[PDB]
């Protein structure tokens, strides 16, 4: 469930 970076 790896999320992409947004910060």
């Amino acid at each position: 469930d790896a999320e992409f970076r947004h910060d």
Epitope: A2, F4, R5, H6
Partner: antibody
């Protein structure tokens, strides 16, 4: 004015390593919040890998074993390597930018065409 | 991977018609930070894709107001209020919440004859 420009070898033989470079102007990868990714369009669109101002790297898991992304902020360039190419890697390769304050692919390169063939 | 399913894959229209394209994701595009990173791109013949909409419904600067995006969770729509000839091309939805970042297959907006 922000621009990105991809360069590659044009043609490679199966089993060779693809070396792509993205050169850019009008911004710097050293800037906090900056990132650049690679997307290709095989003979729809497929995202490959992505790198951030702080050297954080993201890869498409199905392709990870063949991919390596890196940067040289001084040269203001980003690099992608794809090992062991085969005919399915024939595609147009794009680089595209995102930033934490404009978090979307607003700026793309024109693309570099690669043909892998014996 | 998050599968992005566009319906229809081919959309014949007459100039001036309203047009709508569905994008359904296999999982919610809501990110842990609360934003939904759903983008829409248009690719014209001999061009790189161009950004139309980001975060579901925010129109990118310079994009004509006949374009709009809506939806939430797993269900998204791109709407063109009146189709102009320059709008013909391939439309892609794209999610950047989850790795790998994934595009829909492309919907070709084409002319009725």
């Amino acid at each position: 004015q922000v621009t990105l420009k991809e360069s590659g070898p044009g043609i490679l033989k199966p089993s060779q390593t693809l070396s792509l470079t993205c050169s850019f102007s009008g911004f710097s990868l050293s800037t906090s919040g900056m990132s650049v990714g690679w997307i290709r369009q095989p003979s729809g669109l497929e995202w490959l890998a992505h790198i951030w101002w702080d050297d954080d790297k993201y890869y498409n898991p199905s392709l990870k074993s063949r991919l390596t992304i890196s940067k040289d902020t001084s040269r203001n360039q980003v690099f992608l390597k794809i090992t062991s190419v085969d005919t399915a890697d024939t595609a147009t390769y794009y680089c595209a930018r995102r930033t934490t304050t404009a978090d979307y692919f607003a700026y793309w390169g024109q693309g570099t065409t690669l043909t892998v063939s014996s | 991977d998050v599968l992005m399913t566009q319906t229809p894959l081919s959309l014949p229209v007459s100039l001036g018609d309203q047009a709508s394209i569905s994008c359904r994701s296999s999982q919610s595009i809501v990110h842990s930070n609360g934003n939904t990173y759903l983008e829409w791109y248009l690719q014209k013949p001999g061009q790189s894709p161009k950004l139309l909409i980001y975060k579901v419904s925010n129109r990118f600067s310079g994009v004509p107001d006949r374009f709009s995006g809506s939806g939430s969770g797993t269900d998204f729509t791109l709407k063109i209020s009146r189709v102009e000839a320059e709008d013909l091309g391939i439309y892609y939805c794209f999610q950047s919440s989850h790795v790998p970042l994934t595009f829909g297959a492309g919907t070709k907006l084409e002319l009725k004859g």
